[PDB]
Homo-oligomer: A and B are copies of this chain.
Amino acid sequence: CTAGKDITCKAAVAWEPHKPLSLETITVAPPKAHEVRIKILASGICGSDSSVLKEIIPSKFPVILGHEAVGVVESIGAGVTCVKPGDKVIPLFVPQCGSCRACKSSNSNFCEKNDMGAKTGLMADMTSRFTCRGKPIYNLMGTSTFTEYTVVADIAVAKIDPKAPLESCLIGCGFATGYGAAVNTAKVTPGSTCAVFGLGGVGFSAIVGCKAAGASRIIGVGTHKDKFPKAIELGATECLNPKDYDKPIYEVICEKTNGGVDYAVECAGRIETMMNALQSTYCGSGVTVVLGLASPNERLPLDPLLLLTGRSLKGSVFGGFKGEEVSRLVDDYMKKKINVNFLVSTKLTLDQINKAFELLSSGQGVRSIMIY
């Protein structure tokens, strides 16, 4: 057994930004009080991971990235009762302490114990469980999944169906985010018209969400036409490539939808796309949701007049879902209510992790995952 013992395993470390991830042999210490050590079965590669490497999203280095995964509990530390060794779980980059204002609230999931603000890259006691070449390695949002074993706080684990498929790892971020953006944040209504900007893992998940919600028209907007067939198959009623157009994408959309769509979901993070998304909505009531993050300190030059006639601009993290709702998502997935696995376009090993980033960089596929 490995309980109470340090584990040496493989992991993809980011020693510095703008550089390919380095595969290293690392040491994972045993879990401390209210911590759980998890054996990762599968991990996904998110755009967010790429953004940390590019320094778009602030982070300390060296660091082990990844926050989209499914695994099984290897051992638990003192005080843990929410899970036991052998339980299949999904790590939560947005924890659920259950006692903060956000957790007590029914309209928020932004638990105040998240590390997205402080960015300590360390456990609660300010120490690291990861060691490589005598050096402490920082974690990502209390998770880090680009490693065979990881340690997370017990308030950041979601127990799920023992038989859940490995593709279920997308529910750990990409799918919950896009799907939730349409169903929880925007709150797409039956018969409504929607537009999704950015056709990556999140965008496709948002398309699946708009369809689940009953939208009559779902417009996928992106610049990689090779993805359009896929988008249609998953629910989009049509796709638009802004590069084919000379006139603004939002004028094109408004002209095709009697003034604009009812709901727009921006999944690129670019200021331009955010602006295009907003103006693509009906001025009298359109709702726009932003999910991505722009560079360090870029700003959206917003004309208050665009909101005055009736528009709403919203944002959310993890699709607005609470950790206690992840299991329900896995259940629906296994009951075929949502085909998450349809979004997995590539399966790799941890050794090929850099290939996944290459696929993103280029801008193709849907979502690659790694099987450990």
Contact = CB atoms under 8 A, between A and B. Distances in A.
A299 B258 CA distance: 27
A107 B300 contact: no
Contact of A314 (B258, B292, B311): B311
A274 B304 contact: yes
B310 A320 contact: yes
A317 interface: yes
Interface residue tally on A, bucketed by range: 35 or more
Contact of A271 (B101, B300, B304, B306): B304
Interface in A288-307: 290-294, 297-307
B313 A312 contact: yes
A153 to B, nearest CB: 19
Interface in A253-283: 258-259, 269, 271, 274, 282-283
A33 interface: no
Interface of A, helix, strand, loop or mixed by DSSP: loop
A319 to B, nearest CB: 11
A107 B302 contact: no
B315 A290 contact: no
Given A110-B310, A311-B315, A315-B311, A105 B293 contact: no
B300 A310 contact: no
Nearest to A309: B110
Given A299-B301, A310-B109, A258 B101 contact: yes
A297 B302 CA distance: 10
8 contacts: A101-B282, A102-B310, A108-B285, A108-B310, A290-B304, A294-B304, A307-B315, A311-B315
Given A293-B304, A297-B303, A301-B302, 15 more contacts: A101-B282, A101-B284, A102-B285, A105-B285, A108-B310, A110-B283, A274-B304, A291-B308, A292-B304, A306-B315, A307-B314, A307-B315, A310-B320, A311-B315, A313-B313
